Amino acid sequence: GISRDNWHKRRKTGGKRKPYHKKRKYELGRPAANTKIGPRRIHTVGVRGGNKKYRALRLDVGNFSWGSECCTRKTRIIDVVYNASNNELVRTKTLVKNCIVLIDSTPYRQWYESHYALPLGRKKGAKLTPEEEEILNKKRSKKIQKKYDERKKNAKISSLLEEQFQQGKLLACIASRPGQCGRADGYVLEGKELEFYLRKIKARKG
Amino acid sequence: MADIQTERAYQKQPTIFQNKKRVLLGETGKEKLPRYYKNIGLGFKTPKEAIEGTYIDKKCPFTGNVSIRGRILSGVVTKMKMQRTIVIRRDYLHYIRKYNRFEKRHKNMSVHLSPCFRDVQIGDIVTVGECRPLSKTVRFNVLKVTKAAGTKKQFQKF
Amino acid sequence: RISGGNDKQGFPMKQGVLTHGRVRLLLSKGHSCYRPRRTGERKRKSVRGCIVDANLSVLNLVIVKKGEKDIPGLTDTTVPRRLGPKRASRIRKLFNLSKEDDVRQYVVRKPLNKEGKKPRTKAPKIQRLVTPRVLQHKRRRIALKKQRTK
Amino acid sequence: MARGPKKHLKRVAAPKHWMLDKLTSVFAPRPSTGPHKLRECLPLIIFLRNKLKYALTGDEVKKICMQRFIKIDGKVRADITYPAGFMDVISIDKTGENFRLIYDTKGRFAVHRITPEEAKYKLCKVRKIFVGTKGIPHLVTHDARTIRYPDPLIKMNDTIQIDLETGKITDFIKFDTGNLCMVTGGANLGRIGVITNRERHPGSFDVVHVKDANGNSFATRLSNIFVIGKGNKPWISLPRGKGIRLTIAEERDKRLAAKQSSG
RNA sequence: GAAACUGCGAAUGGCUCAUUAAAUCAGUUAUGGUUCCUUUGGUCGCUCGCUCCUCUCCUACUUGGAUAACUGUGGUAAUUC
RNA sequence: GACGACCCAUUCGAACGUCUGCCCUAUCAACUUUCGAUGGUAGUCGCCGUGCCUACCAUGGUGACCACGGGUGACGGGGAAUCAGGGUUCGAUUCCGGAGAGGGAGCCUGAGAAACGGCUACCACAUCCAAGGAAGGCAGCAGGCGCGCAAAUUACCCACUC
């Protein structure tokens, strides 16, 4: 119906070619996923040669990663901020490859606190002392220090990172096609990208 | 080089990561970027200029994804007025067997040109090679540029 | 209970087709009032709604609750159902056998009344009943797996 | 016509090395899918009534194959058509006969009878090396056998002896200059001669010179060469003709010399 | 052993030349840009987890519940209804 | 032994893409573009590559070496008739490739179809009816009407070839 033909469209000279063969099943469209954020709705689509293709509508979880220290945990996908293909897609909260979105930022802290033995940015130390100090202080004899010594000075954590934990959000990059895969996935922004997209955000809105 | 972004998106090479390990350079140092390149094979050699320089392009074969496989051809420059591509020409001779004469015919083709080559001028010989499609009228990329023909680009004392 | 019937001009009645008009619905396998003559085939026949009127030829009423009286031409007449089960586990549930009792004589025996020769008693063939042959196929199934690993 | 795959091949579309006529009807057998390619096959039924003439009609072959007197590559086959090709062994055990499919210098599949002892193995070219899962290697051959754990010096364009009984190759030949080779396709076909020289081009369609023991030099593409044994010493039995590739004048001279058309 | 469910084929063939001027098509090349019923050859035990909740005998000596043919009653002027 | 299933390889292919090759016409010389024309960047879609499609951005692309437009009683090729040499003319038609099943469009099933001996709708036709409705597509083999200068049996049979 809606098709992805190539026997339409002008040649280089501005010429036209007269109608040749009728539309066929291997040149075919099928309308866009237009996936949002919400409760999971998945549809299974039969596709050529078999080998079913998953189309995801309204995901709310993706597997992001923090490849700086190589941990990857499942985290909720809150809202869109920047979509580098169009401005309109952000307004209706459409989710596609290479967007910039927000997450809860929760397990990354839990991992950091247990492994590097330090909290991130904090409102107050009063919260920590009755519980959440129980993990941070430890009763080991022998391997209070012995393990943790090797973790020291490999946890400088950068300025633009640390400030974001306090808000409870982090900026990560969709590196999947949700409409073809059936899953959202990605990597979290680091380095110069994370400097770049801040400037685009503050430029465009506000 | 220090600016290579003018898009609404960030530009970078695949197969590159930015580590956050160690901290001590003093003033400056590693630009926090190792360069990516690869061999092309077939007796063609990567330019020094590619490995030196900084550009992000995915359609050149010295950096980005695209193979050269199948045919290899030549041509000549005729025009450049487009960004990251050129136009070229192929002069050749068509024979007729009723007569015993030939006649001239030419075709024109576009082909993509790397930001690596920037010494191109209109009238240089160029070499190209078969590739997977990049665009509607581009199927090729440059492998090499040369000048080795009459009325050279600069005075003889080389 | 009314289970449906036939409109005048023979158009049948199905469920989920509110009001009484005559509507042409797309039909396919797994719907009322369709017979496929080819796989994936879809026709668009006319049918008629649920809501009863006097525009109908005949209705089918199923007796659900039985009254005090006995209507002479139907409920006084008594006809037994024909067939017992053909499957194993239905025989187990029916006559309330244990797991260990070895069913082999708890089948219904269906009489052949006459044939001018002698009367037969027929039985069906049990399915999902373990026999020695079954167990061989499962023993050879595992023998190959071990042989493969070796 | 086409919307999916075809299931007919006619007489006149079919190759000429099955030596078909033109006064039986429009259709020809067409080999069904298998390990060999249809411009390199000899279909089974063409061996049984257009060569050896046991059968006379296709219905007879259907009554023969069902009895399971036929084998191919030491296994039992039971269909009218099977696509046996170069270097396979047919085995009828009732007659005590064994055949081999190999090329005449004319370039067509001949009758090359052999001892049953010879018919316990065949010679197979390697074409592709492919590392499978968890550090296990594979071979790929033209008869489409995947033989795992080969020796780690065997590479493509070598040939390997396979025991039909147990698979799992016992020995091999290594591709080297001066070894004896047979041709399997192209304009030169059925010629036997030593390698002599190689030629390489980066790209494709490398060629391979050849020279025989009649003092003639010729060349062919790389991928039409098959190795048969070390220099002037085949590790297989050879038919009459022996890759000489006589001119037409000399062939005339032989026939009028023996005066041979009667016994 | 009729009938009926199930699997497979019906996209092959046969026919026509209306459309179609770099299109079709032929020679030459390319999938390192991809899909592939079927045949042939290999692949065939975590993978270590019975993790249920009934509080541990657990259907694995084999688990769950409906439809046709069939039997019987019908509607329509008419249908492979 | 039989059947089924996951993946890899193989076979039969399928689908896109490279270079070169075309009949008549200028009383057809400028053509193509936000109704994407050419390119760049990102995304969607698709079996995959790709302006295929969308957003943003650039202004290109093609032509006297004949583009663009129009015409063709133009399906293409393997070939055929004539012929000293060079040519000229024909190729609907038994092999191969392609396109189409009254005209258009959409779609189900399947590994493979935008299928017509599958389906749905519109349009042009034509059939039955108790007037409520229902059913159809011979460019398959025969056969009929019509059209014309112009073209065969409503025959016999799966034995051969598949």
**Residue B101 neighbours by CB under 8 Å, 6+ apart:** B95
Å separating the CA of residue C135 from the C1' of nucleotide E57: 22
Q: Where are the domains of chain D?
A: 2-117, 122-172, 175-245
- How many other CB atoms sit within 10 Å of the CB of residue C42? 11
Which chain A residues are Cβ-neighbours of B7 within 8 angstroms? 84
For residue D91, the 8-state DSSP code is E
Which chain B residues are Cβ-neighbours of D203 within 8 angstroms? 42
What is the rounded distance in angstroms from the CA atom of residue C107 to the CA atom of residue D84? 55
- Whether CB of B15 is under 7 Å from strand F: the answer is no
- Whether CB of D13 is under 7 Å from strand F: the answer is yes
What is the rounded distance in angstroms from the CA atom of residue C63 to the CA atom of residue B56? 81
Structure-token pair, residue A56: 């995801």
Q: Which CATH superfamily is domain D122-172 in?
A: Ribosomal protein S4, central domain (2.40.50.740)
Any D CB within 8 A of B43 CB? yes
Structure-token pair, residue D35: 């390990």
The strand F neighbours among D residues 161-220, by Cβ under 7 Å, are: none
Q: What method did the depositors use to determine the structure?
A: cryo-EM
Bases along strand E below 7 A from a protein CB: 10-15, 19-24, 29-33, 35-45, 59, 61-65, 74-81
What is the rounded distance in angstroms from the CA atom of residue B46 to the CA atom of residue B36? 12
Reported in sequence order, the residue ranges of chain B that DSSP labels E, i.e. its strands, are 72-79, 86-95, 102-111, 125-130, 140-146
D159 phi and psi angles, rounded to 5 deg: -140, 155
Q: Which whole-number Å values give the CA distances from A143 to A110, A114, A136, A146, in the listed order? A: 19, 13, 13, 4
For residue C19, the 8-state DSSP code is S
Specify the residue for token string 């695949």.
Answer: B14
Which chain B residues are Cβ-neighbours of A98 within 8 angstroms? 9
**Residue B42 neighbours by CB under 8 Å, 6+ apart:** B68, B72, D202, D203
Bridge partner residues of D124 (DSSP): D160
| Cα C138 to chain centroid, rounded | 32
Which chain D residues are Cβ-neighbours of B43 within 8 angstroms? 202
SS3 D97: strand
The strand E neighbours among C residues 15-44, by Cβ under 7 Å, are: 35, 37-39
Kind of pairing between the strands at B125-130 and D225-229? unpaired
**What is the SS3 assignment for chain A?**
CCCCCCCCCCCCCCCCCCCCCCCCCCCCCCCCCCCCECCCEEEEECCCCCCCEEEEECECEEEEEECCCCEEEEEEEEEEEEECCCCHHHHCCCCCCCEEEEECCHHHHHHHHHHCCCCCCCCCCCCCCCCCCCCCCCCCCCCCCCCHHHCCCCCCCCHHHHHHHHHCCCEEEECCCHHHHCCEEEEECCHHHHHHHHHHHHHHCC
Please, what sign has the CA dihedral across residues C58, C63, C69, C70? positive
Instruction: For the domain made up of D175-245, give the CATH fold.
Output: SH3 type barrels. (2.30.30)
What is the rounded distance in angstroms from the CA atom of residue D194 to the CA atom of residue D188? 14
Nearest to D71 by CA among D42, D88, D91: D91
The strand F neighbours among A residues 104-143, by Cβ under 7 Å, are: none
Q: Which CATH superfamily is domain D2-117 in?
A: RNA-binding S4 domain (3.10.290.10)
What is the rounded distance in angstroms from the CA atom of residue D210 to the CA atom of residue D216? 8
Question: Please, what are the domains in chain B?
Answer: 2-152 (2.40.50.1000)
- Whether CB of B132 is under 7 Å from strand E: the answer is yes
Reported in sequence order, the residue ranges of D11-80 that DSSP labels E, i.e. its strands, are 27-28, 41-43, 70-72, 75-76
- Whether CB of D74 is under 7 Å from strand F: the answer is no
Contact D236, D229 (CB under 8 A): yes
Q: Find the nucleotide nearest C45 (Cα to C1′).
A: E81
Any D CB within 8 A of B29 CB? no
Is residue A142 reached through a cis peptide bond, with omega within 30 degrees of 0 on the bond before it?
A: yes
Structure-token pair, residue B81: 């007025």
Identity of residue C137: H
- How many other CB atoms sit within 10 Å of the CB of residue B86? 22
